[PDB]
Amino acid sequence: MTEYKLVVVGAGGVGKSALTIQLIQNHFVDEYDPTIEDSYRKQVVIDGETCLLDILDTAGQEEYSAMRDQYMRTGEGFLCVFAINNTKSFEDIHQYREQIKRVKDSDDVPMVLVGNKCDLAARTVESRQAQDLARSYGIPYIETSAKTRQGVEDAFYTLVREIRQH
Amino acid sequence: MTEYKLVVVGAGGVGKSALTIQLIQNHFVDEYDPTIEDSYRKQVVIDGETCLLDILDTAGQEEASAMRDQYMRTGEGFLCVFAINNTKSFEDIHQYREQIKRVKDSDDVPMVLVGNKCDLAARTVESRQAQDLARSYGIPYIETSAKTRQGVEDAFYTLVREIRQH
Amino acid sequence: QMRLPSADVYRFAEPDSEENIIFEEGIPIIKAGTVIKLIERLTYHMYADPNFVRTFLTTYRSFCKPQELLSLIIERFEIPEPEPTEADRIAIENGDQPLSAELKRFRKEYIQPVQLRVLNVCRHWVEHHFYDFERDAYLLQRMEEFIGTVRGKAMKKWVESITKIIQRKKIAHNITFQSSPPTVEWHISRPGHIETFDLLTLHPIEIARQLTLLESDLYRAVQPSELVGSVWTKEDKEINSPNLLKMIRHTTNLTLWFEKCIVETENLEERVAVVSRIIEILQVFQELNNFNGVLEVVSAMNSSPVYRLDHTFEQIPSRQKKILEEAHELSEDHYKKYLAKLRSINPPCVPFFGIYLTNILKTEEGNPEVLKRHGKELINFSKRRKVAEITGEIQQYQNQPYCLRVESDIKRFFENLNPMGNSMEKEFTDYLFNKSLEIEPRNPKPLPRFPKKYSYPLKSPGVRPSNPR
Numbered sequence: 121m122t123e124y125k126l127v128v129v130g131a132g133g134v135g136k137s138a139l140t141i142q143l144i145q146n147h148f149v150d151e152y153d154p155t156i157e158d159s160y161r162k163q164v165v166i167d168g169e170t171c172l173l174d175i176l177d178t179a180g181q182e183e184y185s186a187m188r189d190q191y192m193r194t195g196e197g198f199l200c201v202f203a204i205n206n207t208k209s210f211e212d213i214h215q216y217r218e219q220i221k222r223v224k225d226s227d228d229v230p231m232v233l234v235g236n237k238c239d240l241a242a243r244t245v246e247s248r249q250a251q252d253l254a255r256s257y258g259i260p261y262i263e264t265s266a267k268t269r270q271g272v273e274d275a276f277y278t279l280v281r282e283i284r285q286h
Numbered sequence: 287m288t289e290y291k292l293v294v295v296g297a298g299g300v301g302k303s304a305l306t307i308q309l310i311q312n313h314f315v316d317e318y319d320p321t322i323e324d325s326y327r328k329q330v331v332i333d334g335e336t337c338l339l340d341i342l343d344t345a346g347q348e349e350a351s352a353m354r355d356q357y358m359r360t361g362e363g364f365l366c367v368f369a370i371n372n373t374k375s376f377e378d379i380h381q382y383r384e385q386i387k388r389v390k391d392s393d394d395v396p397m398v399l400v401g402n403k404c405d406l407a408a409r410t411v412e413s414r415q416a417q418d419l420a421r422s423y424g425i426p427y428i429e430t431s432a433k434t435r436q437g438v439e440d441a442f443y444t445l446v447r448e449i450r451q452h
Numbered sequence: 453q454m455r456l457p458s459a460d461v462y463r464f465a466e467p468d469s470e471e472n473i474i475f476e477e478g479i480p481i482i483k484a485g486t487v488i489k490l491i492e493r494l495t496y497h498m499y500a501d502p503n504f505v506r507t508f509l510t511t512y513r514s515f516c517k518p519q520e521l522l523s524l525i526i527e528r529f530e531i532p533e534p535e536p537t538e539a540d541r542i543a544i545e546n547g548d549q550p551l552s553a554e555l556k557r558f559r560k561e562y563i564q565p566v567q568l569r570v571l572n573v574c575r576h577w578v579e580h581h582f583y584d585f586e587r588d589a590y591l592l593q594r595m596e597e598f599i600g601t602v603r604g605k606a607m608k609k610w611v612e613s614i615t616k617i618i619q620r621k622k623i624a625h626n627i628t629f630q631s632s633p634p635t636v637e638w639h640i641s642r643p644g645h646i647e648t649f650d651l652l653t654l655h656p657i658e659i660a661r662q663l664t665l666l667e668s669d670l671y672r673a674v675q676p677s678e679l680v681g682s683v684w685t686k687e688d689k690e691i692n693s694p695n696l697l698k699m700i701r702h703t704t705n706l707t708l709w710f711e712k713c714i715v716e717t718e719n720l721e722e723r724v725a726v727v728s729r730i731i732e733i734l735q736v737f738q739e740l741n742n743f744n745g746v747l748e749v750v751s752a753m754n755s756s757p758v759y760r761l762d763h764t765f766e767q768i769p770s771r772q773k774k775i776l777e778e779a780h781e782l783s784e785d786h787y788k789k790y791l792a793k794l795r796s797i798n799p800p801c802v803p804f805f806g807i808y809l810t811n812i813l814k815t816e817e818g819n820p821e822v823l824k825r826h827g828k829e830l831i832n833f834s835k836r837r838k839v840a841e842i843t844g845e846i847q848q849y850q851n852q853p854y855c856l857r858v859e860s861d862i863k864r865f866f867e868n869l870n871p872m873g874n875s876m877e878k879e880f881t882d883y884l885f886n887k888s889l890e891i892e893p894r895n896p897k898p899l900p901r902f903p904k905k906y907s908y909p910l911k912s913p914g915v916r917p918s919n920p921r
C-alpha cells in the first residue's frame with residue numbers, strides 16, 4: 121500500500137495549521153489532540169487506489185528558519201499555503217517555492233498552491249492573482265475555508281494526483 | 287515510565303517545603319511561608335528506571351487539620367518529616383502515622399521517617415530516640431538538611447524503592 | 453451547601469446541573485462548565501486539587517479577564533454564616549450563650565476550607581503569575597486592599613505571607629550542588645585569548661559544555677506567559693514573547709555558524725576536520741542531554757549547502773558516520789525516537805522547544821472555546837487542560853540546573869556570535885549555498901583544489917575528558 125509523505129509549508133500565523141487539522145478530524149468531534157501520534161497519518165481512497173497520507177505540519181516553528189531545509193527534505197509532495205487576507209503571506213510564496221526546488225534538487229517538484237480563508241476579514245489577494253501566479257508555475261491552485269471545511273480534501277487529493285501524475 | 291505519588295507530611299515549619307524545593311530545584315528556600323497545598327513533578331532515574339515523581343507538599347499548621355484525609359487518600363508513599371531541634375514536632379509524628387494508617391485502612395504503608403534540619407548542633411531529639419521509633423514502625427530513618435542537601439535525595443528515593451517493592 | 457444558610461444570597465450555592473458543569477470518564481476531571489462553576493471547583497471544599505489551580509491560572513485569560521477573576525473570588529470568599537439555629541435561639545433567650553454545634557460544623561467543613569483554598573489561589577496567582585499585576589496597577593491595588601481587609605485569626609498566618617510575597621515581588625538563585633563540576637578544558641586557544649577563539653581552537657568538550665549552559669539558561673527563562681494563546685505567532689510576537697524568541701533565534705544562529713564554518717573552509721582536508729569536529733561536539737551534546745544542541749547540529753548537516761557535500765562526508769571516520777546518522781534518526785518519523793529519549797533520560801536536559809510550540813498551537817486552534825449544551829455556552833475546559841499539560845511538561849525540565857562551570861570569556865564569545873553580519877536571510881542563505889557550489893561543484897565539473905587556511909594543527913583532542921590534580 122503506497123504511502124505519500126506530504127509537507128505543508130507557508131507563512132506562519134495565518135491559519136496555516138487549520139488546513140491539516142480540518143482534514144484529519146472528520147470535523148465532527150470535540151476532543152482534538154495533536155499529542156496523539158498517528159493523528160497525522162490518514163488513510164484515504166483517491167481515484168480508486170487506496171493510499172496512506174502522512175502529513176507534516178510544523179505550524180508554530182516558523183522562527184526556527186534554519187530547520188526549513190531539514191523539514192522540507194522529508195517530502196514527496198508539497199502544499200504551499202498563504203492567507204487570502206494577508207498580502208505578504210502570499211508574496212512570500214515565491215520564496216518558499218525556490219527553497220523547496222533547491223532542497224529537493226529539482227525543477228519539477230509536485231506541489232499545489234492553497235489560498236486559505238481563515239477568518240472573515242477582507243480578502244486582499246484576488247482569486248485571479250493567485251490563479252495566474254499558479255499558472256505561471258505549472259501547479260494547481262485550490263481555495264479552502266478554515267471555517268466550513270470547504271475544499272480542504274479538494275486540496276490534498278489534488279496534491280496526491282500531482283505526485284502520481286509526475 | 288513508572289509513576290509514583292509521594293506525599294510529604296509533617297509538623298508546622300519543619301522543612302517539608304524547604305526539602306521538596308531542594309529536591310526539585312537545588313535551591314534552599316530561606317523564607318518561612320506557610321504552605322496550604324503545593325504540588326510538584328520531577329522526572330528522575332532511580333536504579334535504572336525512569337520514574338515520574340509526583341510530590342505533594344502539604345500544610346503543617348493545625349488550621350488545615352480539617353483538610354488532610356483527602357490527600358492521604360490518594361498518596362502512594364509518605365515522607366514523615368520532623369526537625370531535630372523541635373521535640374514537639376517529633377512527638378507529633380505518632381499521630382501522622384496514625385491518620386495515614388486509618389485513612390488507608392492498611393498497616394503496610396510505604397513511609398520513611400525524615401529527621402530534617404540537621405545542619406545545626408542545636409539537636410534536642412536524639413538519634414536513638416528517633417531510630418527506635420522508626421524500627422517500631424518497620425520503616426527506614428534518614429536524617430537530612432535542606433540547607434546543605436545532605437540526605438535529601440537519599441530520603442526521597444528510598445521512598446520510591448519502597449513503593450516499588452510492596 | 454453542603455448545609456444550612458439560605459442559598460439565595462451566595463452565588464456558589466448554585467446546585468450542579470447538566471446545564472452548568474460537565475464531567476469526564478480519584479477526584480473528578482472537568483470537561484466544561486460555567487465560569488462560576490469553574491471557580492467553585494477551583495476552591496472546592498471537599499478536596500484540594502493543586503494541579504487544577506495551575507491549569508487555571510496558566511490559562512484562564514482566554515475566557516475571563518483578570519479584574520473579573522479577582523471580583524469573582526472575592527465574592528466566593530465572602531460566605532454567609534448560618535443564622536443562630538433553633539437550639540441556639542432558645543439558649544440565647546434564657547440567659548447564657550449558645551453552643552453552636554452546626555454553626556461550627558459549617559464553619560469547619562465548608563467555610564474554613566473554601567477560604568483557605570481561596571487564599572491558596574491568591575498565593576499562587578501572585579507568586580507565579582505576577583505578570584497580570586505588573587500590567588495593571590489597579591488590579592494589584594484591589595488585591596492588596598482585599599488581603600489587608602481580611603480579618604480572621606485562622607487566616608492570620610496566611611494573610612501575612614501573602615502580603616510579604618506581594619512586597620518581595622514588587623522589586624526583584626542560590627544553587628547548592630552535591631559534587632564539584634569538572635575542570636574547564638582548554639585546547640589551542642589559551643585562557644583569556646578571546647581573539648584566537650574559533651570552532652577549531654576551542655576544546656570540543658568545552659564548546660559543548662558552555663553552549664549547553666547557555667542554551668539551558670535560555671530555555672529556563674521562558675515563562676508560560678509567552679506560550680499560552682499562541683502569542684508567539686501574532687504581530688506582537690516581539691512584545692509578548694521575547695524570551696522564547698530569544699532562544700529560537702539563538703538555536704537558529706548556531707545552526708548558521710555551523711553551516712558557515714563548513715562551507716567556507718574551502719580546502720578539503722581542512723573541511724573534513726571541521727565537519728568531524730562538529731560531530732564530535734554533537735556527541736558531547738548527547739552526553740549532556742542537550743537536545744536543542746543536537747538538533748542544531750543535525751539541522752545544519754541537513755541544510756542545503758551542507759547536505760550536498762558528498763566528498764566531505766565520504767571522508768568522515770566510520771564511527772562518526774554512525775553518530776551523525778543516529779542523531780538524525782531522532783527527528784525521523786515525527787520526532788518519534790526523540791520524544792522517546794526525552795521521556796527517559798535523567799535530567800538536567802534541554803529539550804528541543806519547537807515540538808512544544810506546535811502542540812500548543814494545534815491544540816488552541818483545533819479545539820472549541822465553548823460547548824453548546826442545551827443552548828447554554830459552557831467554557832470548554834478540557835482544551836485549557838490540554839494546553840496546561842504541555843506548559844507543565846515544559847516547566848518540568850526547567851527545574852534541575854546543570855553542574856558545569858561557566859567560562860566567562862567563552863560564553864561572551866557565543867553570545868556575541870553573528871554569522872549573518874549585515875546581510876539578510878535571503879542574501880546569506882544564497883551565499884552559503886554558492887560557496888557550496890564553488891567548493892564542490894555540480895557533476896560532471898571536476899572537483900577543484902583550494903589552499904589551507906588554518907595555521908594550527910587540525911587534530912581533535914578527543915571528547916574523552918581529562919582530569920588532573
Ligand SMILES: Nc1nc2c(ncn2[C@@H]2O[C@H](COP(=O)(O)OP(=O)(O)NP(=O)(O)O)[C@@H](O)[C@H]2O)c(=O)[nH]1
Nearest residue numbers: 299300301302303304316320321346403431432433
Ligand atoms: N537550617 C535549616 N533551616 C531549614 C531547613 N529546612 C527548613 N529550614 C527552614 O525552616 C523554616 C521552615 O521552612 P518550611 O520548609 O517552609 O516549613 P514547612 O515545612 O513548609 N511548614 P508549613 O506547614 O507551614 O509549610 C524556613 O525558614 C526554612 O528555611 C534545614 O534543613 N536547615
Ligand SMILES: N[C@@H](Cc1c[nH]c2ccccc12)C(=O)NC1CCN(Cc2c[nH]c3ccccc23)CC1
Nearest residue numbers: 753754758759762765766768772773774776777780
Ligand atoms: N553513505 C550513505 C549513508 C549515510 C548515512 N549517514 C551518513 C553520514 C556520513 C556518511 C554516510 C552516511 C549515504 O547515502 N550518504 C549520502 C546521504 C547522507 N550524507 C551525509 C549527510 C549530510 N547531512 C546529513 C544529515 C543526516 C544524515 C546524513 C547526512 C552523505 C551522502
Ligand SMILES: [Mg+2]
Nearest residue numbers: 302303321344
Ligand atoms: Mg510546607
